Design a protein around this nucleic acid. Structure first.
Ligand SMILES: Nc1ncnc2c1ncn2[C@@H]1O[C@H](COP(=O)(O)OP(=O)(O)OP(=O)(O)O)[C@@H](O)[C@H]1O
Lengths: 349, 349
RNA sequence: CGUGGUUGACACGCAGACCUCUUACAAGAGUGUCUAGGUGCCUUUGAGAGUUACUCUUUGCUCUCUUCGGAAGAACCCUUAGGGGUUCGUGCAUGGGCUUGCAUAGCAAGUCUUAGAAUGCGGGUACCGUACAGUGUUGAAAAACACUGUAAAUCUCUAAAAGAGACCA
């Protein structure tokens, strides 16, 4: 139980009601967490490897993750030209990438639920819930939940943007999710679900485990951008392209706060291999292995670890992580055909 | 063709695109119609007799009508206790009321459709339609459909009060109805549906046939309300209290407009019976039968027709119209049981 | 970017972009490679309903009739082509002399030249060429061939806005 607490809490940087999470992990054998993605565009390393690590941690803790693939949201935002078949193909491509990189799908503790199929199977238990949340929460509160999208004082809203937050908030209760690990973008929807749970008088509020938003590889990009193929490593990139991107990534010397490379290491490399091996010249301390972020940050602040040796090591580790994906997509004919089909689809926005 | 057009146009008071109405009644042999109707407890003379006259005219014009029982909307607005099963029983009771007062169910021209059943049957066609209408119509426009529930523009709405206009706007296309008849308040929703139909380039835009709203009996109130028994008469009322209502109803002599009694005459007894018999005193010209509203109002203006003679004749005509309802209630065991259940249930706004 | 070159490549000096390094963008060094577009044609008919809402004015937005037809042209179909039809594809401001405010002349008011499409802007269409991506053939690489899209993919993707008074301010 305590080990489950540590593993689950390690998933997200912010855990609302840690005492409630403790109670949930003590009483419920398998918590049913919830995280989702819109099957569109490319897939940044943050999304891919962070969700893989989070899901592996949750399954090791014994969590029945219910991934929500938002194909109606992609269609309504007009992704891949608003084609359901193209969006399904992109979703299958992403899921195959994840299966290659390490999602424990074979363990049976991870379920990949499509929004369209699940909704059209049981909407009589879903759309009443969306109407209930829309009725119980007022227009000002719902509009405040949609400011993060960029629609609010900045942009005129299309009622669809009063149905989107309501549907995303009702997804948690439709999936009976006891935990939420959505990104910081939808923490507003998580809080909305919490207050709805207060309204409907439920003693088991959904825990929030918002994943830390990876800053972009370029300086100043606090928000992870998957639409600009210059400030984010994508798991479909080649080895040389990944090396170039990491070499061009921002990395201030002797600065740990706001360091894209250090944060990349902390939440991607260390959680995977339980270590960060760096090979350096004899004048630069030689070969040394860092087993923890504590000694990593201590040495980096002291200046013993320098970017000239740091970035090659990070690039090699990222290539080692991405190699299963590239090998799987080169070897499996179905995966290769999926990659070719996705490359054949031009982005329509 | 022209006879059908005249019969159809005799129903509504404001029919937008009368040219389109004629074109539809020429091209199609059986256009599809609906009426908007929320089942909530007692249902007054405007929703009974005016609605059944309109439906009878439309089915005589060889056009089908789909009765749209808005039980889902009632539940999500909480109206009538917010209980699905007994709201359905109320809807069945009112359907029986319309059957008793007169409705051609033998020919299958009328369709008693419950919103919940139809949505549960065809969610995958209806809810994508709702979201598409939401995408096409902006938040301010959806706000502007506000007075259908009886509120001012400056007030604050709930997100369900934005969900609902889109659900109404999508009910038309979900029913695939060609001519639209509802209250005068839902004109904005009907205009929204028309705009959505020219944003999706569907030919044959739905034709709006707006009804006329009967005002309150007491002068100063122009609205209708089943929760307020001081403004309208019901068909679940007894003869004596109906007479009391008619005599307490405001009716100034030699006044053309603003007379609830005259409007009730024109919209209820003249269309139903093609005539009206008034039992006048022997000093006014004896008993006289009026064949048209024009001559009736002319004789009322000329001063030989007084409220003291109009009210007894109005009461007698209304009672004669309502006799089938009471006879059906006393004869049909199922109808009597439904009425007893309705009386046992409590009505809350 | 221009010089010689019909231009693109090719040498020249430089502008920018691409690649290697102290990887921190910056800053600097390195040696190199690369940039494109051009041609011809056309493009402002008036009306009405809906849309801000509490209305009037100036207009926009879809909008269905209507048209010196949404034209320059594409896709498709009919076929003996000379041709016809459907879908699609439609622009925004101003003149110059006539009279006045002004000595005939900035700009405005009464008509005209629909618009000299005249002045500029932007649009889309067809051809060529360039490069990218894919298809099949000759193919050892390379390249060539014929075909299909892109080049500016990019925001009311969502339509009401302003002024004037109601009408509580
Ligand atoms: N760095 C991250 N770590 C973990 N989860 C993340 C991260 N960034 C986003 N997510 C998750 O991804 C989902 C939102 O995805 P995001 O907004 O990045 O784009 P998308 O909708 O998937 O892509 P597209 O822009 O192509 O539509 C949420 O479920 C959020 O929790």
């Amino acid at each position: 139980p305590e080990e489950k607490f540590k593993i689950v809490r390690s998933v997200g940087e912010e855990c609302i009601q840690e005492d409630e999470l403790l109670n949930l992990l003590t009483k419920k054998p398998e918590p049913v967490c919830y995280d989702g993605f819109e099957p569109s565009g490319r897939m940044h390393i943050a999304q891919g490897v962070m969700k893989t690590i989070s899901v592996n941690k949750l399954t090791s803790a014994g969590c029945r993750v219910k991934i929500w693939i938002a194909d109606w949201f992609a269609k309504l935002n007009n992704k891949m030209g608003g084609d359901l078949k193209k969006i399904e193909t992109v979703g299958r491509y992403l899921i195959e990438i994840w299966k290659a990189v390490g999602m424990d799908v074979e363990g049976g503790k991870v379920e990949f639920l499509w929004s369209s199929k699940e909704i059209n199977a049981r909407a009589d238990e879903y759309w009443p819930l969306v109407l209930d949340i829309a009725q119980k929460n007022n227009l000002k509160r719902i509009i405040r939940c949609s400011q993060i999208m960029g629609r609010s004082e900045q942009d005129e809203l299309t009622a669809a943007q009063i149905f989107y937050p309501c549907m995303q908030c009702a997804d948690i209760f439709f999936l009976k999710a006891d935990i939420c690990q959505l990104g910081m973008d939808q923490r507003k929807v998580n809080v909305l679900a919490r207050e709805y749970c207060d309204d409907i008088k439920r003693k088991n509020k959904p825990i929030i485990l918002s994943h830390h938003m990876l800053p972009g590889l370029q300086q100043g990009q606090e928000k992870m951008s998957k639409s600009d193929p210059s400030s984010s490593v994508f798991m479909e990139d080649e080895e040389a392209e990944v090396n170039v991107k990491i070499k061009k990534a921002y990395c201030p010397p002797k600065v740990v706060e706001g360091n894209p490379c250090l944060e990349y290491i902390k939440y991607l490399i260390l959680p995977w291999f339980n270590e960060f091996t760096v090979e350096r010249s004899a004048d630069n301390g030689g070969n040394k292995t860092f087993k923890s972020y504590e000694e990593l940050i201590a040495d980096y602040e002291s200046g013993e670890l320098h970017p000239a040796d740091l970035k090659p090591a990070l690039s090699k580790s990222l290539n080692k992580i991405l190699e299963p994906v590239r090998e799987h997509f080169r070897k499996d004919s179905n995966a290769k055909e999926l990659l070719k089909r996705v490359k054949a689809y031009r982005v329509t926005k």
